[model samples]
Target: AAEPAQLRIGYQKAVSSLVLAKQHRLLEQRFPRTKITWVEFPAGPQLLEALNVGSIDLGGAGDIPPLFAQAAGADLLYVGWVPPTPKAETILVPSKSALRTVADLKGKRIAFQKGSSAHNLLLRVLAKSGLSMRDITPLYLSPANARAAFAAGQVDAWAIWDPWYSALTLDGSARLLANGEGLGLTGGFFLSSRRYATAWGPFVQQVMGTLNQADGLLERDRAGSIKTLAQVSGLPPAVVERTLAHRPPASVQPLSAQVIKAQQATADLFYAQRLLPKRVLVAPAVWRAPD
Candidate 1:
């Protein structure tokens, strides 16, 4: 008899993956033979760091973490991705800041996690608008730190994602610059190690299925979902409710062409901007192989 494989999973507090796992208990049921460990991360960059170092097996992250990880040669894979949602990610400037447009960010200090989706969004926003990394000062900070910095008048702008986006706007702390709306891409994803995905695809598939169903449940029970989030995050229910409207699709299906293209676009931008060493094909590493 073979030894049971261990599935070390991590998730975000409010992301679809965590909510799904918490609500459906699919991994808990499917991986009964294998040890299932669930840990919560602050954000996707931290989540991806754990995944790359083997502290986690499967987890969710924004489309950006993998690019930085791949550039650094981290061992990870993208199992599935969500389509881009409008206002999914955006940059927030202080209400009084003169940085009125994305172009105003040139040479200004921008704060975002070094290896997260917001990091990618920030870079893409810069490059697309003809700005270079040297044109702006990059502050490698996590979401919480960025928020504090923004509140303290440290950075010129903070690139951010949902929940945070909702919080800043709802609280009247910051204003939006450019949102991920109509970005023609998916902004979030579920990632696992290549070895883990191949060895335990059946289990991964089960987790994906449960997450997809949970997404539907969230859509149907919006008020209940907001209440649950408010309880867990200690945030006002209005904040969570507003964030849900900006959330990406919740199905945890395997990586598709659209996902590949979005990731590839990220890789291309990073490479051109020298944020990534070379264009690493993330699809081959992220998708699960046939059993």
Candidate 2:
């Protein structure tokens, strides 16, 4: 495939593949003729929203965020995805807090990223406990702000993802109430705006190949990956190590029945519960075999 004129990649610290590729200049090296640039986003929701408004050509976001974007009518394509890191996203409370389980969250102020993966997790946790959004005061905050709010007791708990989650728990400031372990989340999608996907034809495939290559390299050099990811993510090596330990060697691949089925189920769940304004089926947006 011919190199694109430019490859603008949006990344969050949690997407190890994109973060590693950017840090190692793997994408740059792989597409030297292209004007490669990287933009860092605070979370998946913001990243996907930026793509929706045409701020970027390509990026990745978790299952919920991308579904949220589609519900709002974004012209994005699911090119590929990172595998399910079930323990990667979780709900946490202070170590000394009275909360011992998800059921105890009633009437509490819980902070999370809005229209994000955290949003979905919080909804399900509440439902699992026979609660609903009305049962808790939902505090919408960025990952950084949520950490501060949680630490200062401004919020009783937080729903968040790593290495942000790992960073808090690393110092014993927090403990988990629940995670994606048994949740029906289908991981995240590596998205390319249809404008770019249609125009370039083969860029998403190239991007996936480049990032998956970086994932393979990162796994083979675990000690080195920790340092590089830590530096790129502004996390200490220990936090990055803890984050990586819970997830498989992150790789992106095209969509599949297994992935789509899980994604569709959650999308429907959100719609059914009014988390979304309308239905947003997962299959239509798929960049098939890109899983």
Candidate 3:
């Protein structure tokens, strides 16, 4: 096929780097020759759903979505990995509630996106508490609904990532039960359609470069990055600041062996839980740019 004329990019408000990039038009400026269109999704799973259905050429998502997508046979490639923002995602209980620890969550209603990075965080936190998914009444929900349910006291806990976690925390209505800090869950990925990755190495490189530059901007101009993220995400500055403070360094890395190994462990965990139909070898789909 002839060189594509445009690039459709999917992003989430929570991924601040992408949000900053979009706010600044980094991708458009970097790829002046190719038309760039931005599509926003509420979360990673939905974004990858769009990627799978061919609605977008490239997107970013949390760790578990790609695993689930791969299981469902989505022709996608893992193009970039963000440094671990382990504390960026967390499990929370009502501020005045008695749930003081992960163990206290047992037999309680928990709301979270079913197959998300938050899901893995929840499970790992549960295991640390000597409990399992069966110990809690799992209520699979999107972040918005989960937030609503949590606020309404319909659910005892909510597992989510920033800026939702940060936003909820700002009101002091929710108390943290666990975060990814020690649970081993990392940040997410920049994904590309197989069609796009196969044909457009230069395009992927340019996008990755732009994302890295955005990452640098975030690190170098923390105050500015926080302000732009808050404005773009419609989140409070305090929330963005808290998130930025806890987040790992803002850098995009090529999919490396270390990343694949960690992903494989997550994939195996999902398979063990019967969340996936079969085990997925993430290495196969990882994009290794030509030397």
What are the lDDT figures for the candidates, one per model? 0.76, 0.83, 0.84
Clashing pairs in 1: 77-286, 78-286, 84-185, 84-186, 86-181
Question: Which candidate, 1 or 2, would have the higher lDDT against the true structure?
Answer: 2
Choose 1 or 2, whichever is better by TM-score. 2
Compared with the true structure, the alpha-carbon lDDT of candidate 3 equals 0.84
- Global CA lDDT of candidate 2, please? 0.83
Candidate 1, residues 1-291: lDDT per residue as tens digits? 342467677888757436645755666675567777778888887888888889998888778777777777887878877656657688888888878998999889998888777776776677678987788898888778888898999999888877888888888888899886555545678888888777767767767776666676568877777777788788888888788877645666777776687778777867777777768777667675475
TM-score of predicted model 1?
Answer: 0.90
Q: What TM-score would each prediction reach against the true structure? A: 0.90, 0.95, 0.96
> Which residue runs does candidate 3 get wrong by more than 4 Å?
1-3
**Against the correct fold, how does model 3 do in TM-score?**
0.96
lDDT of 2 by residue, 1-291 (tens): 576788888888777767778878988887778888898899988999889888888987877888888999986888887777879889999888999988899999999998888888888878988998879899999898898888788988899988878988988989888998887667777888887887775666887888878777557888888888888767899998898787876588777788888888888888888879989988888874322
Go through the candidates in order and give the C-alpha RMSD of each one to the true structure.
2.3, 1.8, 1.6
